[PDB]
Structure formats: structure tokens, C-alpha cells
Design a protein around this motif. Sequence first.
Motif, PDB file in Angstrom:
ATOM      1  N   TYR A 214     -13.803  15.797   4.229  1.00 14.54           N
ATOM      2  CA  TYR A 214     -13.301  14.836   4.835  1.00 14.54           C
ATOM      3  C   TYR A 214     -11.815  14.788   6.738  1.00 14.54           C
ATOM      4  CZ  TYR A 214      -7.786  17.010   4.335  1.00 14.54           C
ATOM      5  OH  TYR A 214      -7.579  18.237   4.294  1.00 14.54           O
TER       6      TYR A 214
ATOM      7  N   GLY B 298      -1.841  -0.522   5.045  1.00 10.88           N
ATOM      8  CA  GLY B 298      -0.145  -0.779   5.140  1.00 10.88           C
ATOM      9  C   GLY B 298       0.042  -1.745   4.370  1.00 10.88           C
TER      10      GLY B 298
ATOM     11  N   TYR C 224      -4.992  11.779  -1.085  1.00  7.65           N
ATOM     12  CA  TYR C 224      -5.117  10.808  -2.042  1.00  7.65           C
ATOM     13  C   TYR C 224      -5.466  10.728  -3.372  1.00  7.65           C
ATOM     14  CZ  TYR C 224      -3.914   8.283   1.888  1.00  7.65           C
ATOM     15  OH  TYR C 224      -3.440   8.010   3.431  1.00  7.65           O
TER      16      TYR C 224
ATOM     17  N   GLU D 230      -5.139   3.686   9.152  1.00  2.00           N
ATOM     18  CA  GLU D 230      -4.836   5.361   8.832  1.00  2.00           C
ATOM     19  C   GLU D 230      -6.572   5.295   8.291  1.00  2.00           C
ATOM     20  OE1 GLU D 230      -4.311   7.654   5.302  1.00  2.00           O
ATOM     21  OE2 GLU D 230      -3.312   9.226   6.166  1.00  2.00           O
TER      22      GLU D 230
ATOM     23  N   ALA E 254       0.985  -1.171   0.002  1.00  2.00           N
ATOM     24  CA  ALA E 254       0.234   0.154   0.073  1.00  2.00           C
ATOM     25  C   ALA E 254       0.839   0.966  -0.329  1.00  2.00           C
ATOM     26  CB  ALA E 254      -0.841  -0.017   1.218  1.00  2.00           C
ATOM     27  N   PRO E 255       0.035   1.977  -0.512  1.00  2.00           N
ATOM     28  CA  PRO E 255       0.983   3.498  -0.635  1.00  2.00           C
ATOM     29  C   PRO E 255       1.310   3.982   0.976  1.00  2.00           C
ATOM     30  CG  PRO E 255      -1.700   3.548  -1.531  1.00  2.00           C
ATOM     31  CD  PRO E 255      -1.024   1.988  -1.174  1.00  2.00           C
ATOM     32  N   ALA E 256       1.792   5.362   1.029  1.00  2.00           N
ATOM     33  CA  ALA E 256       1.977   6.166   1.986  1.00  2.00           C
ATOM     34  C   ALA E 256       0.859   7.106   2.377  1.00  2.00           C
ATOM     35  CB  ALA E 256       2.731   7.216   1.651  1.00  2.00           C
ATOM     36  N   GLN E 257       0.409   6.310   4.207  1.00  2.00           N
ATOM     37  CA  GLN E 257      -0.280   7.478   5.296  1.00  2.00           C
ATOM     38  C   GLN E 257      -0.203   9.317   4.773  1.00  2.00           C
ATOM     39  OE1 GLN E 257      -0.200   5.142   8.737  1.00  2.00           O
ATOM     40  NE2 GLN E 257      -1.499   3.245   8.254  1.00  2.00           N
ATOM     41  N   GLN E 258      -1.597   9.560   4.510  1.00  2.00           N
ATOM     42  CA  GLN E 258      -1.391  11.437   4.405  1.00  2.00           C
ATOM     43  C   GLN E 258      -1.338  11.398   5.660  1.00  2.00           C
ATOM     44  OE1 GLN E 258      -0.871  12.863   1.835  1.00  2.00           O
ATOM     45  NE2 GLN E 258      -0.847  10.955   0.712  1.00  2.00           N
ATOM     46  N   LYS E 259      -1.924  10.940   6.862  1.00  2.00           N
ATOM     47  CA  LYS E 259      -2.173  11.715   8.455  1.00  2.00           C
ATOM     48  C   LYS E 259      -2.431  12.793   8.668  1.00  2.00           C
ATOM     49  CE  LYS E 259       2.542   9.182   9.102  1.00  2.00           C
ATOM     50  NZ  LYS E 259       3.787   8.844   7.770  1.00  2.00           N
ATOM     51  N   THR E 260      -1.778  13.972   7.789  1.00  2.00           N
ATOM     52  CA  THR E 260      -2.631  15.668   8.328  1.00  2.00           C
ATOM     53  C   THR E 260      -4.250  15.497   8.505  1.00  2.00           C
ATOM     54  OG1 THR E 260      -2.814  15.751   5.288  1.00  2.00           O
ATOM     55  CG2 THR E 260      -0.884  16.579   6.658  1.00  2.00           C
ATOM     56  N   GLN E 261      -5.176  16.105   9.159  1.00  2.00           N
ATOM     57  CA  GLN E 261      -6.173  16.222   9.377  1.00  2.00           C
ATOM     58  C   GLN E 261      -6.411  17.774   8.406  1.00  2.00           C
ATOM     59  OE1 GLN E 261      -9.015  15.352   9.954  1.00  2.00           O
ATOM     60  NE2 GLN E 261      -8.622  14.804  12.552  1.00  2.00           N
ATOM     61  N   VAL E 262      -7.740  17.447   8.590  1.00  2.00           N
ATOM     62  CA  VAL E 262      -8.587  18.207   7.655  1.00  2.00           C
ATOM     63  C   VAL E 262      -8.431  19.221   8.459  1.00  2.00           C
ATOM     64  CG1 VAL E 262     -10.977  18.050   8.948  1.00  2.00           C
ATOM     65  CG2 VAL E 262     -10.488  18.650   6.660  1.00  2.00           C
ATOM     66  N   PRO E 263      -8.576  20.986   7.397  1.00  2.00           N
ATOM     67  CA  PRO E 263      -7.487  22.111   8.125  1.00  2.00           C
ATOM     68  C   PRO E 263      -9.040  22.064   9.319  1.00  2.00           C
ATOM     69  CG  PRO E 263      -7.727  22.629   6.094  1.00  2.00           C
ATOM     70  CD  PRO E 263      -7.793  21.516   5.987  1.00  2.00           C
ATOM     71  N   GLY E 264      -8.673  22.906  10.432  1.00  2.00           N
ATOM     72  CA  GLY E 264      -9.878  23.453  11.698  1.00  2.00           C
ATOM     73  C   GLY E 264     -10.607  24.264  11.287  1.00  2.00           C
ATOM     74  N   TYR E 265     -11.804  24.407  10.298  1.00  2.00           N
ATOM     75  CA  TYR E 265     -12.230  25.861  10.098  1.00  2.00           C
ATOM     76  C   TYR E 265     -13.178  25.030   9.715  1.00  2.00           C
ATOM     77  CZ  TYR E 265     -11.992  25.665   5.041  1.00  2.00           C
ATOM     78  OH  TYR E 265     -11.635  24.904   3.439  1.00  2.00           O
TER      79      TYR E 265
ATOM     80  N   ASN F 167      -6.134   2.850   4.683  1.00  2.00           N
ATOM     81  CA  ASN F 167      -4.692   2.545   4.571  1.00  2.00           C
ATOM     82  C   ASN F 167      -4.240   1.582   5.822  1.00  2.00           C
ATOM     83  OD1 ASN F 167      -2.318   2.488   4.126  1.00  2.00           O
ATOM     84  ND2 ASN F 167      -1.897   4.653   3.498  1.00  2.00           N
TER      85      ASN F 167
END
Lengths: 306, 307
Positions: free
Chosen positions: B12, B72, B102, B21, A1-12, B70
Motif C-alpha cells: 500500500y 471525505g 481500512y 486521501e 465517510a470515515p476518517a482518513q488514515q494518513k500514515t504512510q507505508v513503512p520505509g523499507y 477517501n
Amino acid sequence: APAQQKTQVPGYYRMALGDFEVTALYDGYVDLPASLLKGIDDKDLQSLLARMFVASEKGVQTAVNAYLINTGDNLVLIDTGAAQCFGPTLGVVQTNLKASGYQPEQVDTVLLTHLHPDHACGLVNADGSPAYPNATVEVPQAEAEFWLDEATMAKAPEGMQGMFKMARQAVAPYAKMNKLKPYKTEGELLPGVSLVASSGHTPGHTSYLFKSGGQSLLVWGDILINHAVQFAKPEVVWEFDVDSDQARQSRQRILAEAATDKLWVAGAHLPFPGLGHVREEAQGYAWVPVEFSPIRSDRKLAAALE
Amino acid sequence: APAQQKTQVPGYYRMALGDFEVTALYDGYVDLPASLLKGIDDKDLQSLLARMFVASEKGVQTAVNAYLINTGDNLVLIDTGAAQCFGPTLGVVQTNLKASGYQPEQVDTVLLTHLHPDHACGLVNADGSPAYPNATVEVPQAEAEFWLDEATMAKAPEGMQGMFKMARQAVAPYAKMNKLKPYKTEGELLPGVSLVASSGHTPGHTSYLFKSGGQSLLVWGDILINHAVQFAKPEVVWEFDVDSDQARQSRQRILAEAATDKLWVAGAHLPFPGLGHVREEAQGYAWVPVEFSPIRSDRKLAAALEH
Ligand SMILES: [Zn+2]
Ligand SMILES: [Zn+2]
Ligand SMILES: [Zn+2]
Ligand SMILES: [Zn+2]
């Protein structure tokens, strides 16, 4: 599988209030020990946290929110987050403001619920410049005559002195350009916004009521710090309420009025976006958060069904 | 004041589940009439909606959600939204998947809870091309044997046959490239995911249980459509449950298990992001939505190091 994006949606998060546009802004979080910073039984406390699936131990992760309201006549920011006064898990209010499509230069008015660091320190960039360089800062007079007084800081205990200094530093760049306004109870600040006194948590703690098109929003500040316990048990107090008894009385009043008027609430330490309603329960109260929605302009045609 | 921005934050939302994830993806909303689709008194119904500040009249605005996990080992999308099958208030799943960082080509598996159009139509782009070109589509066998069977379609009520056509159209391009896989009650499809049968709402309706690092998430599909009434009164049924009696039983079972085992739930029609827990109340149950948070990597690292 590809890399986990991790980042959260912006806080607004955007919400319409009649003709007013509300943008909730996330400052980040702080881990707060449930322990004290309280006023009840350990068994009851853990029971109340568990039923809301709130992890304590390592502390209760607590949101810090601010509110940007575009009325058409004014772009007003209510509170400003902590900048870096409380460490690196906070201070993202200005970046979420930008992410939401606004610029800090457009803010003409800042309303402060109170001068605690997690509400006032966001007034100032890291380099010392004013974060909202065109805004006039409105502070409740009682709040100003307390935190900004010199003797008062001196007759205060060490663990509280820093908060006095941060308050003075937050407000200073605006005082120097004549953009600092301590206001009294009289005179309603802007069209559509009025004052709701709610002293206790700090001496001049103030909540702001916005009204438009028949709808009401109370940006209430720190009426309450932990939604899992203090709605069910309003008698429970917080260690850093300057006067916990008066803070408790303000909360009990505001809770009852909000529940019976069914107005919208925007709460600084309620889970982000911190927008929703208070419902009266058998014993105490419960928090009902907004359901995520785009703005329903089509429904705004209650206007033609008059 | 400058012009109002008006635009909503992208639909999202990211959560960690063990090493997994999770990205919740919003498809949009649909206004559903409170009536008709129900099984209790009008007055009691309005009372349950009002205590959660839900407006009926003009109908109950209902979210439609899909879930990107995700693991892994895989990038798996559970449900896909409605595309334009239900009009322009829906079909935003793919643009939200793109906003979340993605690209649809990266999806190797699509899991479907059932073949209703608000779950299966997102499988196909407007141009007719597969929305997830590299993905295998896993559909429960009982679900395929029902919705994709011509004879069943033929003898079906006029009001239902549109759903049959939509199901067939959604699945068509994947069947063409041999990327359509009906699976039985047995066989585990991917590492970290198990099957939880929950038939009733449709005959093969299936909920997916993801498990990592001691934490579990049930991407449960449509075991429940209205959070404000069916947690408190799970015996209340939905007009579009194919078998409402069976749907009640699956709902009761799934809720009871979610509450006692404290599973995270990812729910297709719960208010977005549709993530949270189920709590036992005196009468029935209550939904406890997740609190908005960045992923706590510090907390996850600390927990692993301590023991
Ligand atoms: Zn405070
Ligand atoms: Zn505060
Ligand atoms: Zn369905
Ligand atoms: Zn559905």
C-alpha cells in the motif's frame, strides 16, 4: 465517510541480490534549496526539475537512505541516516530497520560511505548509547583522518564545524569499546564486498560493491544528490562537496561504469528505495528505478537452466 | 548472520490529492509474454524493454493495482484486483487494504474501469460473499451490456468465455442485494469524480478523474499495459484489447491530455504504486513515477494560508 488514515507505508523495501538479501531503509527527507548547491543556469535547472515533476521553491525534498544487507555470513548496515542531527524530518532508519523485521543488536558490521551527519549520526541513539551495540564501524581512513582530526576542525569555517563535532560524536561510543576501525584501500572487508574509491564529495568518500550469484550492487553513497539534474548533467556540482571538481570526476567515472556494466545501484539521496540502474542517454545519463516486486525465488531457477 | 527476513513491505502507498486521501493497493503480479500481445518488430521491442531493464523471457512481470480514495464524503475503491481468478500471484488487494488501516466494510462505492477479471474478481471473497458488503458497484453501461449479456457470451470465442463467467460471478452478489448500478456516459456518480470515456481495451472501458483543491488524478484503468513500450510507442497495441484500433485512439488522446494538463495518473498495470505523471518526449511520451514521500501536511497548510 470515515476518517482518513494518513500514515504512510513503512520505509523499507526488500530485494534479492543473488544469495544476498538487500533491505533499503528510509531515513526521512530534507528540503534542500535548489538555488546554489549547484553549478548551472537557472532556466536549465527549472526545466530539468519540471520534467521530473520535482517541486523546488520551499526547496527540493530529498530522500536520505541506508542499506541493510544480509549475506548469510554478515548482517551489514551501509550508512545509518541522520538520527536527529538534521531535525525531526529524519532519523527513521532504525525504526524502519525494526519494521523490516530485524533488530539493531543483530548488526555485526556498519560500513560508512562517508562521515556526513546524514550518514553517520544514526550510529547513536538519542540517549547517547550506540545504536548498533554489537557492530564494528568501518570508516575509510582518509575520511577518518579528515573529520576526526582536531586541528582540521579548528582551521575550518564555523558553518562547517558542527559537522566535525557530529562526526566525532557519532563515532565515539564505538571508539570507546574498540569497535571503530579506520581501514585502508587494501584488504577486502567481507566476503562478497569490495571497495570502490570515490573521493571528492568528502576526502575519503567510498562506495561499496556487493557481488553474489553473478549480480552486482553498488551502494554508492553521495555520488549524486539530485537525480533530476545530475544524471542529465553530471558536470553540475553540489555546494557541500568538499572538493566539487574531484567529486564531479568520481561521478562521471562511476556513472559511465555503472551504465556500461549495467549493475544495480543503491543511492543514498535517490528517491526511496534508491535502487535501480543507470542508463546512458544521448547527452548524459538517466536513472531507472526498480519496479516494486516481491522476491522472485521461483525465477531464481535460472540455476537449473545452466 | 541471522536468518533472512525475505518478506516484502506491504503493498500500500498513500498520497494526498487536495483534500482527498489516495491509497494505492497492490494485488500482486502476473508474467505476461512480450510477444503475441504487441504490434512492432521483435528487435525494437526487446530494445525498449532492455532500456528500462525489464526482463522478458519467462515473460514481462506485470503489476495489478487498485486505488482507494477517501474523499471525505466517500470511501471509494477503484478496481479490486483479481482475487484468485488468475492464480496465487494475485488477489492481495484486500489484505493490502487492511494493512493500510481500512476495513472492507467501510467501502461505500466501488468504481470499475472495466469488467476484466484482474479488475472485477476482487469483488468477491473466496467463500462467495461480497468482499465489500456495504458497497454499491458502479459499472459503465456499455461494459455491462457487453460482458453480462448471455447472447454475447454464447457467441463469444471459447478463450473469452471464461472472462464472461468471471465477470458475471464477480457482480452476482451485488446484483442480488440491488447494489449493482450500471451508469450511462452522463450523470456524475459521487462528488469530486468525473467520467473520462476511454473505450477500446473493452467496449465500455472508463477512466475516472478525481479533482480536489486544484489537483487532478486520473485513475485510468488499462489504457496502457506496458510502461516501457506504450508510452514511447502508443501505437503499439495489446492482444487483449477487444478493439485495438479504438484502444490506440483512446491511449493517444489520454496520454496527450495527461501530459499537457499535468494530471496525476493512477494506472492499473504501471509499476506499483502506479502513481505519477506523463511527460511529452521527442518520439512519444515517458512515465514519471511519484517519489516516495510522507504526506506533506506542512506544505499543504502553508499553500492554503499563502496567496
Ligand atoms: Zn554527504
Ligand atoms: Zn548525504
Ligand atoms: Zn483489462
Ligand atoms: Zn487489467
